Design an enzyme around this catalytic site. Sequence first.
Site, mmCIF file in Angstrom:
data_model
loop_
_atom_site.group_PDB
_atom_site.id
_atom_site.type_symbol
_atom_site.label_atom_id
_atom_site.label_comp_id
_atom_site.label_asym_id
_atom_site.label_seq_id
_atom_site.Cartn_x
_atom_site.Cartn_y
_atom_site.Cartn_z
ATOM 1 N N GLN A 19 20.099 2.945 71.659
ATOM 2 C CA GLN A 19 19.363 2.095 70.731
ATOM 3 C C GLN A 19 18.163 2.805 70.090
ATOM 4 O O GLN A 19 17.593 2.299 69.125
ATOM 5 C CB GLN A 19 18.857 0.836 71.448
ATOM 6 C CG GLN A 19 17.839 1.085 72.544
ATOM 7 C CD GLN A 19 17.508 -0.146 73.314
ATOM 8 O OE1 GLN A 19 18.204 -0.527 74.248
ATOM 9 N NE2 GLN A 19 16.453 -0.799 72.909
ATOM 10 N N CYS A 25 18.154 -3.897 72.162
ATOM 11 C CA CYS A 25 18.982 -3.982 73.372
ATOM 12 C C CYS A 25 19.955 -5.166 73.345
ATOM 13 O O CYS A 25 21.110 -5.032 73.721
ATOM 14 C CB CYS A 25 18.089 -4.062 74.633
ATOM 15 S SG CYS A 25 16.928 -5.421 74.662
ATOM 16 N N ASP A 71 23.050 -14.662 72.890
ATOM 17 C CA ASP A 71 23.691 -15.868 72.389
ATOM 18 C C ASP A 71 23.419 -16.116 70.895
ATOM 19 O O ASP A 71 24.283 -16.618 70.194
ATOM 20 C CB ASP A 71 23.259 -17.087 73.206
ATOM 21 C CG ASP A 71 23.863 -17.152 74.582
ATOM 22 O OD1 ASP A 71 24.763 -16.355 74.897
ATOM 23 O OD2 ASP A 71 23.420 -18.097 75.316
ATOM 24 N N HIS A 163 15.266 -7.299 79.075
ATOM 25 C CA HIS A 163 16.200 -6.294 78.621
ATOM 26 C C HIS A 163 17.624 -6.841 78.736
ATOM 27 O O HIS A 163 17.998 -7.390 79.769
ATOM 28 C CB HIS A 163 15.989 -5.046 79.459
ATOM 29 C CG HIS A 163 16.734 -3.849 78.971
ATOM 30 N ND1 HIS A 163 16.700 -3.429 77.655
ATOM 31 C CD2 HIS A 163 17.530 -2.977 79.629
ATOM 32 C CE1 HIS A 163 17.459 -2.356 77.532
ATOM 33 N NE2 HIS A 163 17.972 -2.061 78.715
ATOM 34 N N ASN A 186 24.009 0.474 80.158
ATOM 35 C CA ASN A 186 22.759 0.405 79.406
ATOM 36 C C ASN A 186 23.008 0.952 77.993
ATOM 37 O O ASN A 186 24.107 1.419 77.687
ATOM 38 C CB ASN A 186 21.653 1.150 80.175
ATOM 39 C CG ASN A 186 20.233 0.709 79.812
ATOM 40 O OD1 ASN A 186 19.999 -0.118 78.904
ATOM 41 N ND2 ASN A 186 19.255 1.292 80.518
HETATM 42 C C1 LIG Z 1 15.423 -4.729 74.037
HETATM 43 N N1 LIG Z 1 15.418 -3.573 73.486
HETATM 44 C C2 LIG Z 1 14.251 -5.598 74.193
HETATM 45 N N2 LIG Z 1 14.471 -6.777 74.940
HETATM 46 C C3 LIG Z 1 14.952 -7.931 74.421
HETATM 47 O O1 LIG Z 1 15.157 -8.133 73.214
HETATM 48 C C4 LIG Z 1 15.274 -9.006 75.466
HETATM 49 C C5 LIG Z 1 16.754 -9.379 75.385
HETATM 50 C C6 LIG Z 1 16.773 -10.841 75.843
HETATM 51 S S1 LIG Z 1 16.898 -10.902 77.598
HETATM 52 O O2 LIG Z 1 18.168 -10.339 77.951
HETATM 53 O O3 LIG Z 1 15.737 -10.298 78.145
HETATM 54 C C7 LIG Z 1 16.830 -12.583 77.945
HETATM 55 C C8 LIG Z 1 15.647 -13.056 78.523
HETATM 56 C C9 LIG Z 1 15.459 -14.398 78.829
HETATM 57 C C10 LIG Z 1 16.467 -15.317 78.570
HETATM 58 C C11 LIG Z 1 17.658 -14.884 78.003
HETATM 59 C C12 LIG Z 1 17.822 -13.532 77.682
HETATM 60 CL CL1 LIG Z 1 19.297 -13.063 77.004
HETATM 61 C C13 LIG Z 1 15.462 -11.425 75.282
HETATM 62 N N3 LIG Z 1 14.574 -10.266 75.268
HETATM 63 C C14 LIG Z 1 13.210 -10.334 75.366
HETATM 64 O O4 LIG Z 1 12.599 -9.288 75.624
HETATM 65 C C15 LIG Z 1 12.542 -11.669 75.148
HETATM 66 C C16 LIG Z 1 12.908 -12.270 73.836
HETATM 67 C C17 LIG Z 1 13.562 -13.508 73.759
HETATM 68 C C18 LIG Z 1 13.919 -14.030 72.522
HETATM 69 C C19 LIG Z 1 13.657 -13.327 71.359
HETATM 70 BR BR1 LIG Z 1 14.212 -13.991 69.618
HETATM 71 C C20 LIG Z 1 13.025 -12.082 71.429
HETATM 72 C C21 LIG Z 1 12.677 -11.557 72.661
HETATM 73 C C22 LIG Z 1 11.173 -11.850 75.744
HETATM 74 C C23 LIG Z 1 12.344 -12.509 76.405
HETATM 75 C C24 LIG Z 1 13.219 -5.697 73.046
HETATM 76 C C25 LIG Z 1 12.843 -5.004 74.313
#
Ligand SMILES: *C(=N)C1(NC(=O)[C@@H]2C[C@@H](S(=O)(=O)c3ccccc3Cl)CN2C(=O)C2(c3ccc(Br)cc3)CC2)CC1
Length: 219
Positions: A19, A25, A71, A163, A186
């Site tokens: 990425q 991610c 999702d 992540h 990853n």
């Molecule tokens: C990836 N390079 C990074 N992380 C994310 O974008 C990350 C992915 C998802 S999660 O898998 O962490 C997650 C977390 C809680 C509930 C469901 C899921 Cl799938 C969300 N991510 C986040 O970092 C957060 C987020 C949530 C929603 C949005 Br729109 C943006 C970001 C903070 C939870 C960027 C580092």
Amino acid sequence: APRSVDWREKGYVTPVKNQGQCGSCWAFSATGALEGQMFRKTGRLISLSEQNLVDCSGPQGNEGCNGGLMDYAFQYVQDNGGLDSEESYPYEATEESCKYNPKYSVANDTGFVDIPKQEKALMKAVATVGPISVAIDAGHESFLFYKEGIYFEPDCSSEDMDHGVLVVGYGFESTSDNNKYWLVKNSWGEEWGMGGYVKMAKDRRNHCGIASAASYPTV
Ligand SMILES: *C(=N)C1(NC(=O)[C@@H]2C[C@@H](S(=O)(=O)c3ccccc3Cl)CN2C(=O)C2(c3ccc(Br)cc3)CC2)CC1
């Protein structure tokens, strides 16, 4: 369920991608899960465009290189009626205007399934569905500098995930007291971890929240 599963062996999984310095991610997790489900459906493994997701899924709630949800990505593909191949819409690692071209759509989905928030349910899903998108707490340098073996981080959160990654299987090491793992792909290139994979501790109280937000697309 089988005692071990590895969907790579069955042709469901594309090589590890990278990425870069974009917070995409979620898009790599989502393409990985869709690559798996399209392979089950058609017998054809086709790499899918993360960039198409980064550039075009704002209406569904994604934030480009500043994060997103698998999702929301699956919802985009359904709303959009398709998703371009990686070949047709290559990865740039920066958020750009949407360039989706339906001529080069190679995947579709009809929604998504959120898995119950327990590791036994995650195991059942991995055994029966294919690779599964999961959220983990990757916010420890122990993860950044992971090289090999089963990853276990005592300070990992089961509730605060940051992540998105892909579970491609699970199994056990014959070594000592704690030996079960999730096989996780990853999106940090092949240099990181075990050729880009991490064996995450399994059945140790939902370690790093791996079962807390697991999902996959329907096709
Ligand atoms: C990836 N390079 C990074 N992380 C994310 O974008 C990350 C992915 C998802 S999660 O898998 O962490 C997650 C977390 C809680 C509930 C469901 C899921 Cl799938 C969300 N991510 C986040 O970092 C957060 C987020 C949530 C929603 C949005 Br729109 C943006 C970001 C903070 C939870 C960027 C580092």
